Ligand binder design. Structure first.
Ligand SMILES: [Fe+3]
Ligand SMILES: [Fe+3]
Length: 682
């Protein structure tokens, strides 16, 4: 196509154009739209007049807000000693020998990169708001601009519309001087501000003294939040925050595909290892402040692509996003919560059981309904729901996204969740077949398979990881004729035995209880009315036979109709899961953000007293009851036990299990796993 990069200063526009000419005879090409501001570029990308632009984390928060809904497409990478992550560190630079601490900043003069930028404004002013030095309570006590103008004696905050005091130390002419591209703008202009004696403090990133005064580094210090002062190189132990990198945003559409093609071209041709006169990232030399950080920051070394599930809210993190909002609303007022556990139900039957839970607890629990169980993960990460109970396979995924197992399911007896005088708790993964059949473990190829869902412990992680040991492929779709493994791609072989809903919009091969064949009992039902194997839990056959499941298909079933398949030998008795299983796996657990673990552990124990297996109001509601549909919780559950504080998903899951998912993930990784893997490697 011709990618329309938006620029915001006449030097940037000028660089934009040298790249138009070096790419002018290529497949993906370029134009360089120049507007007066970065917001004027956000509007032009939202109105199809330009296509891309790289924005500071605080401006990436604005681009993602409606009407605009602009997405993170690409992210800058920085030289890290850890790795080379897509984040940087905000630091506050002062001169060696001035005596003040972070506690003495009142009355001083300050130099900021820009109003609303992360290191230059959001992190310092938000941090001072929270320590109690800048006194702001919420928008009803003034703007943040008025609150800072009473703290600092004069500042240069190139962006300030309201207070004139924030433009007083700025350098340049009577109109242009307090603009976002003025000489004292950006990380280096704010550094020159300090170097020229105009600020006592400069709020910049961890690389700024090295980008503008490398031999003069010994004349400068950093202000640490513990009251101390350290050297400019000790930023890793003396920073104010680690923030998300600057990111290339764009309209969420087909053009995205080309914006990355173009950028991966110039990364390869014009990067850090280049020999041309065109440098895309840099070079980071001492230079005029106005020629610094054009189009991309001089500190970038390459671009990394953000996975498509991401949105600004998700890119910036819960802690930082919640900070930019703080500075837009009074604290008491939208902040009551710790009295209500917002549970996340998946699909319609789980929505029904949760609304009764919410009616019968006179409100102590409320419900969010989603469609897939990956949506619950995202809702909890964003602070829009608080807990959900997930399977061992799906706890791995939440564990990569930073959620923690706070309570887990105990499948044996009711009194056993009070334990000193025993520890552990697990269930078993199993291969079930009908006794008439010819199939055994090694006969398993080219057959029909029934799976609880793609992604889950017993019905996919254990079986596919043993078929992946032998097969050496991540194409289990070619290892059967067909199956029903809900959640797979809709037009494949593992979708064909699946039935769908009643059959109204029909929804087959979906990962909720709308699909007939979903979960442990839906996959016994697949074995029974259509397939060769059912990859299930050890008790799925006892629970649905001997007359206990009173549905059509299950009315007549007895446990003599089936047999297990051991990794090898025989076929075995369905009640010998101990000796003929595929694995002993950890149980299902409730996973929450680490800071909400206290509330919901306590709010959930109150709830099981009233509706647990020996609840006091069982009569109205029993929590681990669903009609063999394992709604909200598994039906086998006798009680729920507390998982000790500071337990990591890896420790809960066990090392034996931790290994298996870290084998199948070289095979096709889900879009949620990839997104969260960008954030843990951020
Ligand atoms: Fe920045
Ligand atoms: Fe399970």
């Amino acid at each position: 196509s011709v990618i329309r990069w938006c620029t915001i200063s006449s030097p940037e526009e000028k660089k934009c154009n040298n790249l138009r000419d070096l790419t002018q005879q290529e497949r993906i090409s370029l134009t360089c739209v120049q507007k007066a501001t970065y917001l004027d570029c956000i509007k032009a990308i939202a109105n199809n007049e330009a296509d891309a632009i790289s924005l500071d984390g605080g401006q990436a928060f604005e681009a993602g807000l409606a009407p605009y809904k602009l997405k993170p497409i690409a992210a800058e990478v920085y030289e890290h000693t850890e790795g080379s992550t897509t984040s940087y560190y905000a630091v506050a630079v002062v001169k060696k020998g001035t005596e003040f601490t972070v506690n003495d900043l009142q009355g001083k003069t300050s130099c900021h990169t820009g109003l609303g930028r992360s290191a230059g404004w959001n992190i310092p002013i938000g941090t001072l708001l929270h320590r109690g030095a800048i006194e702001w309570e919420g928008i009803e006590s003034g703007s943040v601009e008025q609150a800072v103008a009473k703290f600092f004696s004069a500042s240069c905050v190139p962006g300030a519309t309201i207070e004139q005091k924030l433009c007083r130390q700025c350098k340049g002419d009577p109109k242009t001087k307090c603009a976002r591209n003025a000489p004292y703008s950006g990380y280096s202009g704010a550094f020159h501000c300090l170097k020229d004696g105009k600020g006592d403090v400069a709020f910049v990133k961890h690389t700024t003294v090295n980008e503008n005064a490398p031999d003069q580094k010994d004349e400068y210090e950093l202000l640490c939040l513990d009251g101390s002062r350290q050297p400019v190189d000790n930023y890793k132990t003396c920073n104010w925050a680690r923030v998300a990198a600057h990111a290339v945003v764009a309209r969420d559409d087909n053009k995205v595909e080309d914006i990355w093609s173009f950028l991966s071209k110039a990364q390869s041709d014009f990067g850090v290892d280049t020999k041309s006169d065109f440098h895309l990232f840099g070079p980071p030399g001492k230079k005029d402040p106005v020629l610094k950080d054009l189009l991309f920051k001089d500190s970038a070394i390459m671009l990394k692509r953000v996975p498509s599930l991401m949105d600004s809210q998700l890119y910036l993190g819960f802690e930082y996003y919640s900070a930019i909002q703080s500075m837009r609303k009074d604290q008491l007022t939208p902040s009551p919560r710790e009295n209500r556990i917002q549970w996340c139900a998946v699909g319609k039957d789980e929505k029904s059981k949760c609304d009764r839970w919410s009616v019968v607890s006179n409100g102590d629990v409320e419900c969010t309904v989603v469609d897939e169980t990956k949506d619950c993960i995202i809702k909890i990460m964003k602070g829009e729901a608080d807990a959900v109970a997930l399977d061992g396979g799906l706890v791995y995924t939440a564990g990569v996204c930073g959620l923690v197992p706070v309570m887990a399911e105990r499948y044996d007896d009711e009194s056993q969740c009070s334990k000193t005088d025993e520890r552990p708790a697990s269930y078993f993964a199993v291969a079930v077949a009908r006794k008439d059949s010819n199939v055994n473990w090694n006969n398993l190829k080219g057959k029909k398979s029934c799976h609880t869902a793609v992604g889950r412990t017993a019905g996919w992680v254990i079986p596919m990881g043993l078929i992946h040991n032998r097969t050496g492929t991540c194409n289990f779709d070619e290892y059967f004729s067909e199956g029903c493994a809900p959640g797979s791609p809709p037009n494949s072989r593992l979708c064909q035995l699946c039935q769908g809903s009643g059959g109204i919009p029909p929804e087959k091969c979906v990962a909720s209880s709308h699909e007939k064949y979903f979960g442990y009992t839906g996959a016994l039902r697949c074995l029974v009315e259509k397939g060769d194997v059912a990859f299930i839990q050890h008790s799925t056959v006892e629970e649905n036979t001997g007359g206990k499941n009173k549905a059509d298909w299950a009315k007549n079933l007895q446990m003599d109709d089936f047999e297990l398949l051991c990794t090898d030998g025989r076929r075995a008795n369905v009640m010998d899961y101990r000796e003929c299983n595929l694995a002993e796996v950890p149980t299902h657990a409730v996973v929450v953000r680490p800071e909400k673990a206290n509330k919901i552990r306590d709010l959930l124990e109150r709830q099981e007293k009233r509706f647990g297996v020996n609840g006091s109001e069982k009569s109205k509601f029993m929590m681990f009851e669903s009609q063999n549909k394992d709604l909200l919780f598994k039906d086998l559950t006798k009680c729920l036990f507390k998982v000790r504080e500071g337990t990591t998903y890896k420790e809960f899951l066990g090392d034996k299990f931790y290994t298996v998912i870290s084998s199948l993930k070289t095979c096709n990784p889900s879009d949620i796993l990839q997104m969260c893997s960008f954030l843990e490697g951020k």
